[model samples]
Target chain A: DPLPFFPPLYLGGPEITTENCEREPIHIPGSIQPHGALLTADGHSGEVLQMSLNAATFLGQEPTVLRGQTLAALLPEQWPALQAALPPGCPDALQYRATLDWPAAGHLSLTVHRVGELLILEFEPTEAWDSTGPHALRNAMFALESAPNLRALAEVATQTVRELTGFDRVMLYKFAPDATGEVIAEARREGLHAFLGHRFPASDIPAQARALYTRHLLRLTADTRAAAVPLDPVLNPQTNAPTPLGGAVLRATSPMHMQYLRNMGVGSSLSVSVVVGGQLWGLIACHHQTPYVLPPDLRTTLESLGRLLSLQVQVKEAH
Target chain B: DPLPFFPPLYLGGPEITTENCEREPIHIPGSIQPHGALLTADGHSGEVLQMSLNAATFLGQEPTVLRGQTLAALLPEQWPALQAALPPGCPDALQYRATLDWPAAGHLSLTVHRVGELLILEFEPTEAWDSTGPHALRNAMFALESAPNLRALAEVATQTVRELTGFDRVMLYKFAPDATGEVIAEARREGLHAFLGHRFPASDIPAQARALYTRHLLRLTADTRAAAVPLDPVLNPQTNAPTPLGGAVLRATSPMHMQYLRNMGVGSSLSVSVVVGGQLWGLIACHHQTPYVLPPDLRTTLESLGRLLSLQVQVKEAH
Candidate 1:
């Protein structure tokens, strides 16, 4: 039920508070982002119950638009490999998702993970690199560490990460004591509106979403134009939570986030959290022109850099 | 003709001079260490030409005492792998060495690399934990980075590297501007004579070897007692110099070094370079009572940490 578009979390709150957005089942929005497609089946029959809102972007038909189709019928080509790669039992963290080659979509990551009770299927475009290793990361840190100032370091980091990730844009968003954020540095692939000087209110991101940024360390949405997958059993059989999507690679973004990026014409986006002294410092928000599946360990390097930058920020700010 | 043993590199003027031990071919002392074994083969035929002086300790027969039998005739079981792993041409530096497992020798890395003109085959006892990689290294770096002082940092690094490589003894050897090294921090097994506080002259680790520490970042020698394997045509076809074994994992040690470690009852040893601001700061000298091999990707982790610590050293030194 993508309903309750009325009291959107990020859209309101002059003075945001956790208790304010408490009513918005903000996490289990019952709908997913269009960037990645999702599919859920009947727990017992394995019959396709629903497809993401943007399913037709790849399948030639919307997910709910189909009739009596099973998981294999929908993705005959990708099913075998995905089925084979699935672990014997459910695992919480996202496992290696298979790749699907399509004419318009190009290559997509067909991920499968158990969020809560249902075995969920998802697809995020993968942006792989030949070398996303610790060696390169160590060097990147050295480069950031070498910079003489916070601005220069963030500038270097945005450039390095943008180039390394081949994303459309990357912004180093810094949070002030007032809880609002400003784009401290930006690296974008030309022709896009520069977010370098853009400012946002604390109410825009909402408290829960910001906390999600710190908790997950990063958030990703592939293609804002695509449809979000929905669960047949919308409520988890056990926890009664929106069918847990923990293991999903294409874990859906909140619709509020979906529309936020859409308003900016951002096709895809992900962000790395920056924390200093245990509190959320800010975030390195990334935007891409198209959907992308992040490399296996690239986030690891980014997360590490985020912390290192946080520590450096502490030092630079003090001095 | 493995006959010259005179004018050792580490011995000479009370204040060792560069010209003091010029004739020694100091990098290649004719004897092999006991913990690991060595075998040399002719370049063309790949036939065994020599065995380490301490061959009997591993082969159950004296290398020179075979009376007439060669190292191959003695350790027939481990010869095939070593013989197979050797390169066909006169490759410069220590090429890939093979691993040999035998009851008498235990598990050994029988490497084949060209040292000067010789296509030498050498052995270093292999550790079973060679598969543990990047994760363990990251853990070690985190632990070391938590240390507050340079001395504490070295103590952490010594213990960290000792546990990472499974070495029996690890000492953080710091050098002074006057060219002296004192063990600032050491992690060694019980009953081992602690080298902490022991000062050494520049001559102990020859100038070339000391320079090597900065250049290679890591120097590994599985056994100090194993013989230095010689090549058939002892001079390089191109340069006519003994094929350089520099930059090699199985690079042979100087007779002076081999003798020095032997006197100290060290069967294996390596020293990771710890440089600060393009200068050789000190050495993370590791010694094993028995043979050992460094784990995979461990070098990358160590070298990166070495630099990371250098920056910290700058800070902590000032403090």
Candidate 2:
């Protein structure tokens, strides 16, 4: 009934109403786009283009500061990793997400989506990002349309999570034929532990655990000591479900998994399901050494991104 | 105007008229079943069952002899290969084409389609068998319906040529990703030079050569020095167009490839197109140590088998 934790306003069987939208708003208006520029690259030819504009009021930077520059000029340090990852002859519309410690923004989330010869990106304040609101909702819808291939869609999803959560490692963990899973794709911060290509045992996430993950698309844990959403009420229903369990959005991790993650030196975790065709295609898992809590709106926005990803996966499978 | 080659008639087609059936009279009345029974095996459970009496009669065998026997008992040597290729868990169909060396039939071609716990097998005499008329036509139709899967169809087609013409070696040559090809599947007689898994350079089959093969479907040169087919003076404007280049099918082998095969000790050759979904999927290639001529009817039968294989491939791709 009511599909458990999903907001009632987002469920099927009702038209949107102001009262409902306000009660559980899926979008927020007037949220400023972070001061940003667009970068386009021709992966085959190694050609790059940068278009910068001033929104000095929002990002405290002038347009004249970054304009008509190549990617190498603005982000000289990241060029090698970016070039190596974006191989020549790679299909068009590839996207990348990265988190960089900029002199001005400190640790900032960067989301990029590629269009033909152009990479449109957004710089967002990692601590303030929310997934459910208008900007993220629009971006998610646009991503569904832009990503024509599974590889492209995976790239976009991985990058978005890496940028949004400010995690050192973000991975697209796809399940094997046996319903066991492995990290098939990943986006990581430079000089960090490489989670890419690392195989994980199926037992890492048991059947019940996977089922729980699928049901709860977003699971974030900022502190190991924080209380979790009580399972007794969710599973048993005898006790009334406790007031929407809250302590910052990152306190949803299970102690057992938290311990396992702590052993790996990861202090924060966020995983969102990527469901396609009503099946679990994979998960976008984000991990950080420092404690983190993504705002509620940001959580909603990421979930919206997950929904767009699901749609893209469905189209790919149909084709 | 008409299909280049003689088109096969379906069971109830206009070509299967009373007069035509009478002209090439089938001695066995419609009331009596043919000699062999059709058998099937459960790939997972190892259970075997005789499927149909008509199928058994075609192989000159009886249903009672094989009923309730395990496939392992029927094909002791091939069980391992079948098991290895089969996907585990739950009952499902497994289609495969396998060669059986029977006491009475010598070598036979079998197409098995396994669905759930039931397997339907169709058996045809190896190319060496002296089959003709209605029997040949019927077997051709059976081959169309019984091909286990796409790869199996190609395998059986090549095997048929090797068995029928006593070829030194026969290969099912599949084009590679880059348009080059190698012998992906093969069947060879004892003392034959093996081309199994051998890679052939793209230059071996140039664009013009591939075009000729696709256009003619059957290319023959009976003897290298024989006179070409004479054209009707009034009907043929170009003598080269209608003329038979050589008397023996063996004559059509390109000198370079001939020398290559000859170095491998192969003297004669025959090839039929295994076109799936109207594109050339592969070829049923045959090579013989001694010169050989394929009669018109036998050639027609092989062509029919090739067409049936094409249909099987189309069906497999659809699934």
Candidate 3:
């Protein structure tokens, strides 16, 4: 069985040079095209690694062509010529249109990113116009409708998120009338563990966390182990000055919370706040055991649904 | 043309004796087709006279007949009966009812009363059913509806007295916002004068007078010249009481006021206070060029109307 075709342990295949295991490439199955390849670096290890065949398939590429190649070697001959056009720090990412002229294969668009020592990439069929925008618009309408009544509205909003994101569990977490809050409404996919009617202590989500969430409507964690943007910056070699990492940039979750979520078997999470009529009504929460990334359109859709639910909640409060 | 054949002076001709006047034979006018006659009494001499005539038709026989007669001789049979029924030492006025049957006419019901030495009678056709109840009820309802608004309510109350006893003019005098009073509304018949907008000084109807009127809605003035009701029973009959008569019952208006109204062409007057919301809102000032009598039924109706107007005025005030 050709040793089951195990993916290489580092992104950009075995030939690429990178330093740390923490910077090695990671793979997520069902995230890209079938029979495709992806290469990303592990931020901790400072090394890039090849993603598994199953993961590459989600990006729309053949596994046979991707098995042993580094990202730089796989690019078309004319692509790397543009490196001179980029500013320092290796430019952030690159994309190209590739045509396979033999064996009935067609053209595809591939996108790649280099973050520190990690090289991340995805190959998508050219026909896929990002559907995230329309999904976001629909979610916004849903949010408008749900805003008038908070409690029931929140339930509807949770269901909408669960359907759109395919999360195993979804929750509407609302602040209590007395300003304390817990999960108010929840829905679960079939064969999944239920969080419906489960109570979480107010301390589980602290005041600071809530304040941050209020300021930023959406928060997500694709994987607990994924390298987070660092709080400190390495000195730039040419400038001899310490570069400041933007404080507003997202950082990894606290280790305690990561452990807790891991214990609960959740590998990814997304939460959108429900705000309407000048008050914080609640949140729509989604959780999955496998890493997942919501398309921008779908994320926006979920956000809009959250807004509608907030308005519905407001109407109920007024009554 | 033989002087146009004037009607008889007495309604059913003169009674032969005092007993006939008192009760001997019933006088049904239509039964005997008797000629109407005029009856008069000398105001100073206290003597009665009757004159009769033969004519083709009866004269001045309508129910509220008020022509060609002094007050005393109109209902001679009922006057003395009412006089005997008065409380001992009470004002020497008569209030009585009688059935009269003239030779040419059927029996008629008569109500008689005395204002001072003058007698007044009002006649109506006889009926088996008692009409006082219905009359009282209808009068009550009218008073209620007509007085639904303050100004009209007060006016109706005052107007009732003026219409009933032929007072020269009746003024609905209301208290000012500052606790003074002015003549606000009036209802006067033709040939009578008006005092529609006349204002009175605060002292004219002071707190004490208002208290008195509030307690006693009714007052009478038989003769302004009559001796005041004696404060002491043993005082000499020939000598008038030494008291100023300011608060005396027999004196309806102060000499100063009587002179004031008389100078304005008013002679004798009766004033009924109209109180609304426990305050002396106004009065029914019944003025006359000559002394007039207010019968029991008339007095009762005016008093009842006053109460109704008071309530109506209260409702208006609330609005």
Candidate 4:
């Protein structure tokens, strides 16, 4: 099980402006991205209770039309295998890759977990699945360790990640001592504008969002302009409130975050947390001009690199 | 002032066999190496009170012959400069290089400080002096950062240090989780025996010596067999016990340590402490088959490298 749990970020208050964005409650967002589908069922009975509205596209039927279905029905062929592999009582998310030939005829990256009395499952279309081998990781680690100074370290980090992620631009954004941010290093496509040395006000990343970045090592938004799919029920019947989706990989992005990226002409974006000394140090942010989704295996590789890079940065920063 | 003070290590108890060395009280050695001369005077009166027994070799007279003299009388030419540079309270050691033309005819490295009511001065013969520059350090840092793993890191460390210090052999001695040690890496003269991968019992270093290493970043024994110069009136009247020499740069090595070095056919040796996460991690041990003394500037360079290497090792060790 994961060491600590972070609840979903929910949108709250008025429009997310410079003043109120910091106060926005984003952990309980009541929707998810259209790129993926989500379903929540009663843990004891396995009866589907709530699901993403986009389920119609993936399930070949409207979510409301499958109100009485069960999770076992949706994954009939692999249900027994999943049940056998699950923790006696899953306290955190567990991942699997399954070929769904009936309702969803595709290779789906599946996440199954128990949140209180609710058993939530998330499914996202995935490509041929394979993990980055240790040899590739060893080479990446060596590249990172070869840097002589912080500036060089950041430069190599952006370049290395951009190569692995295939993002049009990769920037190492670091937090200044006063909490503002600066793009210290960047690797970008030849024609794109460079953001290196650009300074950003602290308000650009809200307090809540920064906290979420620390909790979630990596985050991805497939398309900045993609519409979010609302859950069938706005609130969970078990808690009489929106189910906290902080831990949901498919959780929707805040309107403010989407606007910020869209304004920069970014079609898709990914962020890897650079945490050092147990605090949110900065971010390795990647941007693309077209919708882009990173497969789970590649994302896992990036996540590990992010952690190793954090450790290196912390050591370099010490006296 | 140094963050924490470590008094001199004094030999005590029975012989330093495998059994009793750990229990030795080594912080009040009451003596120093013959390579240097030490003097202690009344802090308030400036009257010389105690001096090392070998004063004649460096000061042109026996230590007892200086009994009635004042510090100002001995350093006639630089007395004013010394007075001007002294810390108001003289709480910790301060270094200076001076040409002693009157009593001593050569250039010398001088360390002055106040230990309780005593103003202590130490003098060691030094050659033409210069300090390491940033460019040299930058290159060394890059070499260290280029290592791909712990094993490579250790290998590079030994090679780099041996090149800098002109030692016959340099070994990266690392401590295991169980407190025993292994010479994990070595860079030695072509004909010397290899200690790489050699294991040693924990009792070899004993407990007190390990604690001192944490307090002192570097230790040197120019000639393991050099005679120790005992301080006149061994016990201080103020403390009614031996004055702590732990912080003295010229303090003598333990009899057991000297014997151990002799057994290995080592004529001179130096050790730079590798402390990580605030604990003693290991040592960069350099050995010379013939008597060899490292200049202060070079020692300072090695000390800085030791610290940086420790940081790098810690980062690599982390998951």
Best by DockQ: 1
| Per-residue lDDT over A10-52 for candidate 4, one digit per residue giving the tens place of the 0 to 100 score | 4333555665566666766788988889888776566788889
Error of 4 at A12 (Å): 8.8
lDDT of 4 at A170: 95
Candidate 4 lDDT at B277 equals 70
Which candidate leads in TM-score? Answer: 1
How far out, in Å, is residue B183 in model 2? 57
Cα-based lDDT at residue B96, candidate 3: 44
Candidate 2 lDDT over residue span A81-188, tens digit each: 566544544332232445555456345555443333334334545542222223233323334345668777787778777766577788889888577677777888
Candidate 3 stretches with Cα past 4 Å from truth are A1-130, A133-149, A177-180, A229-250, A277-279, B1-319
Q: Give the per-residue lDDT digits (tens) of candidate 4, residues B92-117.
A: 43333344443444366666656667
Tell me each candidate's i-RMS in Å. Answer: 7.2, 27.3, 38.8, 18.2
Ranking by lDDT: 4, 1, 2, 3
Which candidate ranks first by lDDT, i.e. highest?
Answer: 4
> What TM-score results for chain B in every one of the models?
0.63, 0.49, 0.50, 0.83
Report residue B263 deviation for candidate 3 (angstroms): 81
Residues A1-319, candidate 3: write the lDDT tens digits.
0012122222123321322222212221113222233444232232324443444344345454454444445554524532322223543322222322222334343433444444344443333333332212322232334244555666666766776678888998777755456777787878876667666765555544565555456666667556433211122222333221111112235444556678888888878877644456677878887877555335545654554355345445545
True contacts kept of 3: 0.00
Give candidate 2 misplaced runs (Cα > 4 Å).
Answer: A1-133, A140-144, A225-252, B1-319
